[PDB]
Amino acid sequence: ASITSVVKTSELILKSPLLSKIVVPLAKTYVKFSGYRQLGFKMNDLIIEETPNMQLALRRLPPTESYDRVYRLIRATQFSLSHKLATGNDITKPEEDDHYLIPYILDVEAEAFEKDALDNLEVV
Amino acid sequence: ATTFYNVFVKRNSAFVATILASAFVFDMTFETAIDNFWDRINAGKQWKDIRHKY
Amino acid sequence: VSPKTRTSNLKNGLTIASESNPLVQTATVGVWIDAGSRNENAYNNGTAHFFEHLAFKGTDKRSQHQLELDIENMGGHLNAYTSRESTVYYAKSFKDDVPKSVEILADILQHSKLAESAIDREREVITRELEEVNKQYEEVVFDHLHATAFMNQPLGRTILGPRENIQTITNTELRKFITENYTADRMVLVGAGAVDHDALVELAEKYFSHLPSSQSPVPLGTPIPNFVGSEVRLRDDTMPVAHIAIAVEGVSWTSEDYYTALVAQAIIGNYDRAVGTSRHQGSRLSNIVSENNLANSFQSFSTSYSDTGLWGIYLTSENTTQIDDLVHFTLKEWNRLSTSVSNLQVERAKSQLKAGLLLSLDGTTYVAEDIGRQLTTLGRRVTPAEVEAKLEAVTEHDVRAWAQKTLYDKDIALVGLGPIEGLYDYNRIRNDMSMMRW
Amino acid sequence: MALRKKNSLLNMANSYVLDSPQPSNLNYFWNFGSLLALCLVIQLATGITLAMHYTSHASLAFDSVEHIMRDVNFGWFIRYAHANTASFFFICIYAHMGRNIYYGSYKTPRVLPWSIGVIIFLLLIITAFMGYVLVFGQMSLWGATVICNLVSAIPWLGEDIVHFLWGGFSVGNPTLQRFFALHYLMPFVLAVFALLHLIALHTAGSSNPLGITSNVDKLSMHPYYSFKDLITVFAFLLMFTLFVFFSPDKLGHPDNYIPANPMVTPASIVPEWYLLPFYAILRAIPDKLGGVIAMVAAILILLILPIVDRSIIRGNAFKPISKLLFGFFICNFLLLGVLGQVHIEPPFIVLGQICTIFYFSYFLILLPMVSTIENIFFYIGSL
Amino acid sequence: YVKKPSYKIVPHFLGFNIPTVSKWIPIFGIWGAAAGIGALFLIEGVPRTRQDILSKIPIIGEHWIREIPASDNPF
Amino acid sequence: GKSTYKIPDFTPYLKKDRNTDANRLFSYFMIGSFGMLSAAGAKATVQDFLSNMSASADVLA
Ligand code: HEM
Ligand code: HEM
Ligand SMILES: CCCCCCCCCCCCO[C@@H]1O[C@H](CO)[C@@H](O[C@H]2O[C@H](CO)[C@@H](O)[C@H](O)[C@H]2O)[C@H](O)[C@H]1O
Ligand SMILES: CCCCCCCCCCCCO[C@@H]1O[C@H](CO)[C@@H](O[C@H]2O[C@H](CO)[C@@H](O)[C@H](O)[C@H]2O)[C@H](O)[C@H]1O
């Protein structure tokens, strides 16, 4: 699935009052049980990157964001191999779990999908 | 020649279909031809030639 | 809606053709001739180009210096070019300097001295031109392309001619060439911009009335070329950019497939990494090439002559390890003109061409060049309404049928210059002219 | 330049076993690949040695196996090693495949090694099935008969194909001699495909338990994973020792110590344990052709995991619902195994059908739904 | 005066659209024939192929109706 | 010897009718015949060879 898809569906849910009332609390619990914050990751660090679109989005990260992501990946890898969890400031707090990558990938995919559409235009 | 090229040769799908169909024909006709020729050069020698006595 | 092209004749058979534009203040008048290098044989090859030099070297009245001064005093300039099938001599001036310019052109064409002293002087100038074209890579590639595609035929010869001929061209053979070829029934006097047609016809009656007519007047743009699939490799490892042309035999000016070949050419189109918009072009080949950095540029062409043409592409690339991919993807895009094109590509290319054929004519020199080219190749100026109708008549079936008989599984002429180690041998290139999956 | 890099032959070995850059955080489930290589080496060494003493003719086959047990020096060990390592091979391959499914090893960019892996698994099944026939005991013969008769379901030509496979009108000497020749060959084909899936993997490298790139933090294969592999090699050899020396027949069927008799039918004809889940799936469909298709589809459906997993994240480490679903899928696969060897009786007939539906609905319904919903929960939950 | 270019997006999937695929439909046809002829040719020797398919073809079909004389057949 | 625009002599090899459909069709007839005999030879080879796996004469007896 494309990030575009995921974001659009999420926005449909967040619009509907009923839907958001039942989905938002579930989603927050899911994230708590997922436990990626206990390895000091932000959610976007987990997105599959071995794709042309994602490699292009990662190249467009500002250098600071890019250097910080590299450190979180190395740090999480060291927790993984040691079978330890983050403690203290290494744990990602909910307020730090920012969608730093989502805007870049949405722009990459926007162009990719427009190109697909326009490759199939029919002069009327 | 243009017609023949355009129908049987231009598209590789058609070329391969023509080659395979020809191979099928060749195989059946060559079999029959060799069988007859073999029977003529070895006439009176084969079981089929003496079978009538028995 | 552009003003109507007026056309008149003289008694000798000289055509006068004009298109006025009351919004400009300059005018381009000149003489388009249906004659060029292709009219030479092997012995006098180079003559037409030699004459072009001598035309500006002095006449029976004005000397070389007087000629220079006369043009300087007019205010505008004179220009000339000789091609394989066409020669042009024109003068861009101010509105009211048109009678001067017609008079100077008439003089240099009819009454040129061709003095042995001047022949001998230019004989060195032209000899130096042989060693300096070497730098204009596009021209080197296209001249080798003609030489090989039309091997040992008149269209295959260069315009400059061999070194041997340059040393042996006499004033006699120069005079003979221009007497046989520069005849009134082969010539068109063209005016574009701030010109009055009736004024131009009067000037033609004054200056070009004593032009010889040919014995057997054929119509303008009257011509047998036997294309050779072949290759020239000019490998030069020290050059950073590879230049490659690939062509098949194309269409003449008066072919029934002339517009179909232009539409097919527009489906592949052009590309240049230096232009900002080129990464966003709709052409499939454009997308492949830009995404993979295969080339600095490519330019599709469909060159026409009276009785043949060349249709193909010219590529330039610094990516010397992926020349194979570049050639592979280009020829697989040509395959798709036979196997896959539909109304989607055809209607898009038609849209782009309907404008393109009009956009090209954006100044008086371009207009004059268009009137002159069309009059000397077709015998008439084709109105934009007729052109719009011929383009509209091109269907996807026409493009597919044309590509299947012109491109699909056909021989190519191929020229490579520069670091072309990665360009495979002829067979592997020519094998991409068809698709085994189809 | 070091010789191991400069020489092209040495450099190939170097690239796979020494300088190969690995993630620094592979867990012990990344050790099954080297265990499978070990099983393959043991099966080649024991199998070639058994071939030096075994006779493929139906009149002598069963007795040649008894001669191996009784007269050949260490023949009992070579025979038991070969028979038990066939079971260990399947334990390791199910573990390796389970690792791959849990950690998303089938996702881009590793679709090619996974797809070749599915063919490896099919070749292992064929190899093991033919090897089991070679004993020519009762289970050998009757297993060959019933499994080869599944081919009769192929429409129009099915019966003809069966007679062609058998080389006669029933399982007999021609079938045994051809199964010997093919059983000897198939492990070499299997080794080539194992090599192919590793060369395909080498373009992306190993995945890792977190599912993220390891391009940020690589370790050489040697010495780190060489020495970590030795631990599981010695653990495997301990398990091997307990079966081969102390309980050599625990994983087998006693009926295979009775010589093949085409007249007497054994009480229950079952495949070896590692084929049992596929046999339960076949029983679930009442139609003969239906059942064969379902059974083949149960393996080929692994090829669609790259498509039906719609997750934006690789692997299950951080996906609580996917982990629950995976747990149910694995336990269902074990229950199918158990149902493969029960009698065709109530209430196991219906249970086998429900488990079969669950097996397929994992791929077709549940994994696509769950992976879609988890995408939304990760996005909304972290806003 | 024209305010906007006139176009639609045709439905597409995996980079295929109906105009393009429709051009290749006949090619799939011929490849299908090629594969059919080839397959049938490969199993021409199988007795069932002869019995059920080849011997039923009009005129030509007698090529595949061949009986061994009972005197020449050990089986 | 010096000019690269003067193509070397290929007249000993050039066919006059090189652009015709007849000319191409002949070469594809040779390629096609070759492909045809290779197909018939492969079919014969495979059929005779694989028949070793069908019941042998002693089994049929
Ligand atoms: C992947 C590799 C292999 C697997 C999974 C495998 C599996 C098996 C199995 C299940 C049996 C039946 C064992 C029994 O119960 O007695 C067997 C028998 C046999 N295998 Fe293999 N085998 C493999 C490789 C080989 C190889 C390479 C040879 C080389 C010839 C071979 C030769 C034999 C022989 C001769 C027998 C019959 C004797 C016997 O039963 O022990 N095997 N194999
Ligand atoms: C003879 C059987 C096999 C052998 C010897 C073998 C060996 C290996 C080895 C050594 C690796 C790299 C180390 C590791 O991750 O464990 C590996 C990776 C892999 N194998 Fe296999 N394998 C075999 C069968 C299979 C099968 C049946 C599948 C799939 C159905 C498979 C799919 C893969 C995949 C996807 C990986 C990459 C996993 C990753 O690192 O993320 N293999 N295999
Ligand atoms: C695991 C069994 C052990 C035997 C190894 C398997 C034998 C067959 C492997 C050869 C197949 C070719 O495998 C290919 O080799 C080259 C060099 O060897 C590797 O190349 C890699 O290493 C070399 C240096 O070590 C670098 O130049 C290169 O940039 C890098 O990609 C490829 O990543 C690998 O895919
Ligand atoms: C993917 C490939 C498709 C499957 C391949 C098919 C495998 C087996 C098919 C037929 C094999 C036997 O098919 C049979 O073959 C032999 C030749 O081999 C033929 O036999 C014919 O020639 C042989 C010698 O060449 C003579 O002994 C015989 O008297 C004559 O009839 C039979 O006419 C045919 O019925």
Side-chain angles (χ1 to χ4, degrees), chain C residues 133 140 143-144 147-148 151-153 158 163 226-228 232 234 408-411 430, chain F residues 2-11 14-21 23-24 28:
Chain C
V133 57
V140 170
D143 288 328
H144 285 89
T148 199
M151 205 176 274
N152 308 310
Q153 299 158 73
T158 63
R163 173 176 286 271
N226 193 359
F227 179 85
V228 182
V232 181
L234 305 163
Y408 197 78
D409 184 44
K410 289 291 269 176
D411 272 349
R430 199 232 191 253
Chain F
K2 193 165 168 193
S3 174
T4 66
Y5 296 96
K6 178 74 167 74
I7 311 299
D9 189 52
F10 284 108
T11 64
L14 258 186
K15 297 164 158 138
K16 185 253 131 265
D17 351 275
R18 42 188 180 265
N19 301 313
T20 68
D21 284 345
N23 176 58
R24 276 153 128 182
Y28 285 117

Side-chain angles (χ1 to χ4, degrees), chain D residues 234-300:
Chain D
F234 295 112
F236 172 97
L237 289 181
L238 207 51
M239 165 198 68
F240 166 106
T241 296
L242 289 168
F243 281 94
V244 169
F245 294 90
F246 293 103
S247 200
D249 286 293
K250 184 132 273 164
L251 300 171
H253 205 303
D255 266 67
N256 231 28
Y257 283 101
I258 302 161
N261 186 331
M263 289 183 76
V264 185
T265 314
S268 44
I269 308 171
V270 276
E272 291 254 88
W273 66 264
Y274 34 82
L275 300 183
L276 286 170
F278 309 105
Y279 181 39
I281 284 165
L282 177 130
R283 282 148 69 147
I285 317 300
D287 187 40
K288 233 224 119 93
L289 179 59
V292 170
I293 291 164
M295 187 186 65
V296 168
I299 296 161
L300 297 184

Side-chain angles (χ1 to χ4, degrees), chain C residues 51-118:
Chain C
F51 178 74
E52 184 198 337
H53 285 246
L54 255 8
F56 300 98
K57 268 348 132 247
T59 82
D60 62 333
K61 291 150 216 191
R62 2 170 98 95
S63 72
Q64 207 267 339
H65 197 43
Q66 198 44 63
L67 190 47
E68 264 156 359
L69 242 108
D70 285 321
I71 294 145
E72 232 95 15
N73 279 292
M74 184 186 55
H77 58 273
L78 254 77
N79 194 37
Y81 48 95
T82 306
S83 64
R84 286 175 171 88
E85 280 211 312
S86 180
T87 316
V88 179
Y89 289 89
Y90 67 92
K92 201 177 177 112
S93 60
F94 215 73
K95 175 197 171 184
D96 42 40
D97 285 320
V98 155
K100 291 170 188 59
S101 46
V102 170
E103 190 265 314
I104 286 154
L105 288 164
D107 201 27
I108 69 172
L109 288 174
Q110 295 164 36
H111 305 298
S112 213
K113 269 199 298 292
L114 313 177
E116 293 134 73
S117 64

Side-chain angles (χ1 to χ4, degrees), chain D residues 43-44 47-48 50-51 79 82 86 89 127 131-132 134-135 183-184 187:
Chain D
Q43 292 305 72
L44 290 158
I48 289 158
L50 287 165
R79 197 279 173 104
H82 195 77
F89 215 143
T127 301
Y132 193 65
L134 296 183
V135 177
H183 181 68
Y184 199 137

Side-chain angles (χ1 to χ4, degrees), chain D residues 4-281:
Chain D
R4 79 182 194 277
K5 292 165 56 185
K6 202 187 173 180
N7 179 269
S8 66
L9 292 180
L10 296 179
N11 191 54
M12 294 181 344
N14 175 232
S15 301
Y16 282 80
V17 308
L18 163 46
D19 286 353
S20 181
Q22 298 297 327
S24 70
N25 64 327
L26 303 180
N27 66 26
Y28 276 99
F29 282 97
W30 265 254
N31 285 27
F32 287 100
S34 65
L35 291 181
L36 286 163
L38 179 65
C39 291
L40 187 55
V41 168
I42 291 166
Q43 292 305 72
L44 290 158
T46 56
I48 289 158
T49 301
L50 287 165
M52 299 178 181
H53 297 281
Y54 166 80
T55 295
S56 64
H57 204 272
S59 73
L60 295 175
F62 186 96
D63 295 317
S64 67
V65 178
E66 295 311 309
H67 158 74
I68 288 159
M69 298 307 287
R70 291 164 183 285
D71 298 320
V72 167
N73 306 321
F74 270 85
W76 58 269
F77 167 86
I78 292 160
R79 197 279 173 104
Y80 286 147
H82 195 77
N84 284 285
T85 308
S87 293
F88 304 145
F89 215 143
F90 276 92
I91 287 150
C92 297
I93 214 152
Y94 284 131
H96 184 71
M97 292 162 72
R99 179 289 308 270
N100 296 334
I101 289 163
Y102 185 91
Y103 284 112
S105 304
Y106 51 83
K107 294 212 84 155
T108 193
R110 292 175 186 88
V111 173
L112 185 58
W114 165 255
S115 308
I116 298 166
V118 171
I119 296 160
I120 296 168
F121 176 65
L122 287 167
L123 288 167
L124 183 72
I125 286 166
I126 291 157
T127 301
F129 158 78
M130 287 174 174
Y132 193 65
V133 178
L134 296 183
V135 177
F136 222 49
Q138 278 284 72
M139 296 304 315
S140 299
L141 168 68
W142 287 92
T145 296
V146 307
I147 283 154
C148 291
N149 266 324
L150 294 178
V151 179
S152 313
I154 294 175
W156 184 52
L157 265 186
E159 311 299 330
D160 297 353
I161 295 156
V162 174
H163 293 166
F164 182 79
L165 301 170
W166 281 348
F169 293 104
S170 65
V171 175
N173 177 67
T175 322
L176 188 57
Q177 300 208 283
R178 89 208 22 207
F179 280 10
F180 176 57
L182 297 173
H183 181 68
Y184 199 137
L185 166 70
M186 221 53 64
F188 295 86
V189 175
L190 183 93
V192 161
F193 277 81
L195 176 60
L196 294 178
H197 99 308
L198 289 198
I199 293 164
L201 179 66
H202 215 64
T203 79
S206 302
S207 184
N208 64 78
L210 297 175
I212 59 165
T213 190
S214 67
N215 291 333
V216 300
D217 198 340
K218 288 293 198 179
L219 249 198
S220 296
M221 174 78 221
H222 176 85
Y224 298 93
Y225 291 106
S226 294
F227 287 99
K228 190 174 188 178
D229 288 334
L230 287 184
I231 297 178
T232 48
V233 160
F234 295 112
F236 172 97
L237 289 181
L238 207 51
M239 165 198 68
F240 166 106
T241 296
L242 289 168
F243 281 94
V244 169
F245 294 90
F246 293 103
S247 200
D249 286 293
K250 184 132 273 164
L251 300 171
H253 205 303
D255 266 67
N256 231 28
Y257 283 101
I258 302 161
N261 186 331
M263 289 183 76
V264 185
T265 314
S268 44
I269 308 171
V270 276
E272 291 254 88
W273 66 264
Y274 34 82
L275 300 183
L276 286 170
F278 309 105
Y279 181 39
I281 284 165

Side-chain angles (χ1 to χ4, degrees), chain C residues 258-268 346 349-350 353 391 394 399:
Chain C
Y258 177 87
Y259 288 95
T260 303
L262 282 186
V263 169
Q265 171 208 15
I267 295 167
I268 315 295
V346 173
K350 279 158 61 167
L353 264 181
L391 263 181
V394 174
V399 173

